[PDB]
Symmetry: C4
Subunit: 501 residues, 4 copies
């Protein structure tokens, strides 16, 4: 199954490969560049590297939680389940150390991905090797075997206690897997799409909350560890609180409380620190916890300032309108009319709709505008019996407008520059010496002046909260220069409306 | 009164229905869609649902305040007023549970409101049912009746104490009414208009302050509850502080203090926590309180950064002007003149007046501009004896300008492109070889070049802080192409001013 | 001196009256509206009201600092200096209470200031009267005189102690002068110009720091007051700390420390609170201090986010340029050239110079642009021997540009659309088959194509970091259509440069 | 070597002199202005002043760390190494005091640098002299010599102890070197280029973290100093904790802990403060620490809100698109197509590319656009065999567009206004009654209508995610009016494509 076990190392066709490479042909050329690279090269955008990084993330979170508790609180932490756990974990981390010499490297100086194993080897030895080589191999068990072979009869003196304490210090080199944890979390969050579509403040504050929990855990383990490597002297907090002979659950609970009282800014344990190890560890935890909590307030502020974005923009613009009205001292009748205007026109959410449609492509503009005006097209007798290209070319030129009742849309006897379609509401056509006529949805008005370039023949007044679509002269002549056969519909309607007067 | 008691379930005509549906005809079609739906369907934007949600909000705030204090601090909390209160409340919550199977559901995937009771039933069973069914029914009294019927003679053993403690745990399922509290507060704040016109930061921080008070209250009740369900062991804070036999007022006061010392970041009660229940509850309250206080700092920051919005924009723009002047190293005479210019021209509040008027409709622009220039129209002899359509079409084209004294507005013998009306201040017309003439409010100048396309015949210098209105050539020719009969007024004035020279 | 003592009540000519009214004639009409109002009406923008508010601010800060310390810590606080101080202060506050019935009221619904004493009386009785009438009159001394006259022989029982404690509670009604303090600080900071030119975040955080100091002071006085009105019971912190018989300096110092430990989030005094007065006062101070400190963090954040405004804008735009270069993966040669371009062109501070000049008036634009190009005008032989109107009309059309060395400004044989003046640097004119010629400051190039509409006759390459001024074709033809006599200078230079080839 | 030791005092040619003066000729004129100034004038932008300020920064950080610990914790701090250290440091600070009378002063009111030694002397005596003259000279050793000479036999009384304590107070005048530290850090960070290219929030928070460490250090020294100058009374924290006779390491560690518990908001030392010196010093440290920590939260917030700038802008704009789609209730098919459109078109980072290219100069625009389209130019047969001036003038006019598959790019029989080049993807040309033809990279389409002004002859539909370059009609006619010889290539291709139909 060397074909099946070789297809996982190359970037398969998905949403991510079709996002990062362009089209499927670039994905195929990338796969051909992978297959010709060498002996089993791992592409970083592949399927094996992704789920391998995910299993290593789960294993690193398990190790960085378990390992300090196993080192500090347990006395002879060399039983068979502990050594089996450390050796299985270090087996996986040596496997990942070896596979990092076969992984393509995404470099932010080239559009391509480095797949030459010599450059991969030199760049991986250049920056992130020594910390991964320290963190992968079991340094403590190597040291125990070396100390066994140098002196076989060494475990009967006061040197042996020093060797056990130095073993418990060397076994904390596995906490250098935080580097691989941070790198694999950043790569995984860049690749995995549900965290990619999230807001960056949310992903950033989840990373911070994870790091705060991890540092509070490690700090509690450190608060117990440094008095544990001193035979619990009479001034450390353990011997003062008489927690030397409790269970490890109570020791870990009170040590985590003593660390957490300095992370979330409370303080202290039972008393003030007394011994110098206590004072300097407490000041270390106070620095780390106050920095992490200041960053937590910073991320909470940056998250809260980006929640109700368009509603906040609407309220900022309407607050500027309020301050404009107060600055020019408008009467409260007009202020009430403007309050009703902004709550009818924008409906609480203000959009830069021109820029939003300008970012989109042409068929998406055509599709959205055909969707947003389907009630108009269904209601109007003209658009329902016309060319859909003509309907779309007309609807891309319209402008949404809202008129309060009583407003004069068109004044009788001025030079007209717009043409109105009615989406919603009714209007009253007032003509001097004639009866007013109501117009409703689907009906349009103000088209004789766009055909004849004369002056307005009849005033038009609103009756309800009218929602109209305006059309300029230039766009109307442009769309009729596209389609001169639909001009005769407006000429028929305008001749009939001149016949009514 | 089935007509009167059926008109409340449908959305009546108000500001909210005329905002959310369009006009009154859409409200009537919505009411006809409600009346044809089925057996007593409740519309969510109606009048019954609104005030029913308001009474349920008052009842839930009362329940979530009272119920934990009644469970934790009182010993045999099964007297008649307590059971009457629980049964009346659970009656109201079962009524609201039943009415949620008849309420229209506003879904953010359709412009319509779902009124089909089958879809209402399936969607309500889909997400928010199990928590409301747990929180509505009295689980504890059902459990007491079931335990009574299984064993009648059960209340004489050590099982009975366990049944009483399990009753006090099951009675905390009424604290799952926080879900209905949060949902009904969000719907009520969306509907009720005085919180709708508020800034979203204010409504958001009021919701947070309510939740902080509620979590501090529940946390104090929890800090007493977990030692109360352990017969007050000798390491809990109650038996250490000898508060086992105090009144419930003092127990609740000190428990609320012990919770609140961790909410507002102070710490602790009398001593450090000792027992493991104390340590883990204290760390729980430290997480909850530090998170709520970090969010409180975040909302206070987001509120404070949006208070004096246009004044902050004015000071940002003037700070950029200050840094421009310092970057180009302007002499302090010009810096003083620019400081006086920005404090005369904008008067401390800077508005994007072009965009503010561009968002408004046409009659509101006409009405605001007729208001802001009524001193000019009353002062000028031309505008007070003219067509109000002409006055409005002229005033929409003017541009407000401010000139410091000594400034040359018009230099003698250049090609003129603007025309100035005087709102406030006096100017000196200087002509080579002739006497200067003062012009005051209502008088205009710079109009011969807009009629003749020649060059400027006389320089004009300011005398005070002049507030003028400028008019371009193109707008002047446009407005006279509208109204060619008002051209003769300017031709008469220009012929008289050429006659003066 | 009724003329001299009547000129202070009306707004004199200053920067503030010439800012808020327009010109000096509006100030004179305002003074005539003041003088005709009635019996000694005080204008709110005057000189008497300003310095009267300032003396009342100093007196209120003195009273709100001194009065709680005098009430709480001193036992029989009825010696002659204390009563003289209270009676002199209440004399001033009754004077200000009376003068508030003669002060003009600035209302944010009218451009005018209300000077009718009936509307002043009704509006002042409407909102801010009852709190000022309580805070001005001595309620405690009136109560002592009334209690003296009801029972002369009352000071020999247990009623007398209750009357003394009720006197010390009634004397805290003078702490309702905080309302007048807040109102007069807001009016004074609006009027006084050195705080008006300050950034609003600075003034706002100074107001907050003042309020935080005042609430910490009052809270320390309250922490001592409530145990002082209980004969110091055995569970209050005073009798626990044995501070009942200390001096008042030590009592005030430790009470202010006990309040301040809850304002700046530290906690506590010597121990936890024990009595219920201690617990509820400590929770009150924890609410007040945590709210004030969250607002202090909010104002510090809003202040810090607006300090290096144009430098922050430059670094935001250059960070976007960096991310553009990294997104398109530009080679590091071009990235170094763009880094040098942004550090030569903008010099670390990026200005929206088009908008900054567009906000200014015409003579200020002319004056700034004549200042910023005086080295060019002094260096060029053309501008130093020309019409200053021509120089200014040319300099308003120029555009500043920066070219790195090696760049081809003009390529030989293209259609030219710009004309370059050299402010700084030297260029090499390269012509096919001819020798290169250096051009230096004052010399201009690229003008034959603007006179002849042909194609470029010679390439031009930069030699140093050239700072040039570009001039478009349209502006060049516009300025020569203004002044056709300066065309012959460019025609002479262009004929000479064609003669050189 | 007076030439070599005189070249360091003048600004040499580097990136900084070529940034701040313009070109190398202005640097040479600045050097000639330096050399003619007087007896050894130091230019502030030179090389000697920079590294002299750097050595003084290192020496001031050393002094402000060491000096308070040497004064407070050591008893008879007058051994030979301490006096040698103070005298060597004060020698360097007197040297810097003298050299400040020879340093050019950058004033923010002139483009030039003041090098007149009279103005340098008067301005340096005007503002920053008295604090530098106090901080430079050893006041304590002068006082000891003066007290020795006034009374030789003075060191045998109770006056001598007062003289030693007054010596330890006068020796804290060396802590006024913080002024020179702050000024030299601000000048050094303005000059040194790696901190100049940093974001200002990073430099500002590094300055704040340095000041917080320094104030925590000085506050710990003060917390020990004020009980040290009182013979350790029985109520200070030293005699309560029995730390009077510990080593100075333990005294400094616990004093720094007692200061730091109030800086990072924890509190307290062993108990509450008792003596009045303890209470007022603790309240001083609480003010200073709470202010510094509120500013630290402010700088962390201002840093975090400016990290992923273009990604945050992309997510803000796409959140506005999401709220647009939810506001108009688009069907989820179109929402999925718009999600794929924004993740193909912008790829997670949204740039204002028009403004970014508009800020750049002309050759940098030409170079970036020739880089970003080299795959197109290499792929197209036209551009690879053409004038590079023509290629660049064409590529400056193109517009990048992205079409999803299935989209109709060009509809058959409309009036065409654009011309499409294919960068990536394939399209299907559909013609009525003919076979579809695939077009791939390098091929262009939609050019017959730009040559003939007719209507579209064939529809074009996308097949993959097409990345195209559009070209308008006006730019196409402009570029062919530049180069009429490349029109015949498009005429040949269009005649061949008409021949295919
Ligand atoms: N004697 C005058 N009295 C009033 N206005 C004048 C007089 N002379 C010139 N003006 C005005 O000054 C303007 C300067 O430019 P115009 O000549 O275009 O139009 C001129 C008139 O409006
Ligand atoms: N048979 C064809 N092969 C290639 N391109 C074609 C063919 N027919 C039409 N086109 C292209 O499709 C375009 C559609 O609009 P035009 O007719 O303006 O220009 C057309 C050509 O560029």
């Amino acid at each position: 199954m060397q074909r099946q076990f070789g297809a996982m190392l190359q970037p398969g066709v998905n949403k991510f490969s079709l996002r990062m490479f362009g089209s499927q042909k670039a994905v195929e050329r990338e796969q051909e560049r992978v297959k010709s690279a060498g002996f089993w090269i791992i592409h970083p955008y592949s399927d094996f590297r992704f789920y391998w990084d995910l299993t290593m993330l789960l294993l690193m979170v398990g190790n960085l939680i378990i390992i300090p508790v196993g080192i500090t609180f347990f006395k002879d932490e060399n039983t068979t389940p502990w050594i089996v756990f450390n050796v299985v974990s270090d087996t996986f981390f040596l496997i990942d150390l070896v596979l990092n010499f076969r992984t393509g490297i995404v470099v932010e100086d080239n559009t391509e991905i480095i797949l030459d194993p010599q450059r991969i080897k030199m760049k991986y030895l250049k920056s992130w090797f020594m910390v991964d080589f320290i963190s992968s191999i079991p340094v403590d068990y190597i040291f125990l075997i070396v100390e066994t072979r140098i002196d076989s009869e060494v475990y009967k003196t006061a040197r042996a206690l020093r060797i056990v304490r130095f073993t418990k210090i060397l076994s904390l080199l596995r906490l250098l897997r935080l580097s691989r944890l941070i790198r694999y979390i950043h790569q995984w969050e860049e690749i995995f799409h549900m965290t990619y579509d999230l807001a960056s403040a949310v992903v950033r504050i989840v990373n911070l909350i994870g790091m705060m929990l991890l540092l509070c855990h490690w700090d509690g383990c450190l608060q117990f560890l440094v008095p544990m490597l001193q035979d619990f002297p009479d001034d450390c907090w353990v011997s003062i609180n008489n927690m030397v002979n409790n269970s490890w659950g109570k020791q870990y609970s009170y040590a985590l409380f003593k660390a957490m009282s300095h992370m979330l800014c409370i303080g202290y344990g039972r008393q003030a620190p007394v011994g110098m190890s206590d004072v300097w560890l407490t000041m270390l935890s106070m620095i780390v916890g106050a920095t992490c909590y200041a960053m937590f307030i910073g991320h909470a502020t940056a998250l809260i300032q980006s929640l109700d974005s368009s509603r906040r923009q609407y309220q900022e613009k309407y607050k500027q309108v309020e301050q404009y009205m107060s600055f020019h001292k408008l009467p409260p009748d007009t202020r009430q009319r403007i309050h009703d205007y902004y709550e009818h026109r924008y409906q609480g959410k203000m959009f830069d709709e021109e820029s939003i449609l300008g970012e989109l492509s042409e068929p998406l503009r055509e599709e959205i505008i055909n969707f947003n005006c389907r009630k108009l097209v269904a209601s109007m007798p003209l658009f329902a019996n016309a060319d859909p290209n003509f309907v779309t070319s007309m609807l891309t030129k319209l402008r949404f407008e809202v008129f309060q009742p009583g407003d004069y849309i068109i004044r009788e006897g001025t030079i007209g520059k717009k043409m109105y379609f009615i989406q919603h509401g009714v209007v009253s056509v007032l003509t001097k010496g004639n009866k007013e006529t109501k117009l409703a949805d689907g009906s349009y008005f103000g088209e004789i002046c766009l055909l004849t370039r004369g002056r307005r023949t009849a005033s038009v007044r609103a009756d309800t909260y009218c929602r109209l679509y305006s059309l300029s002269v230039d766009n109307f002549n442009e769309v009729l220069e596209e389609y001169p056969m639909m001009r005769r519909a407006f000429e028929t309607v305008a001749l009939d409306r001149l016949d009514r007067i």
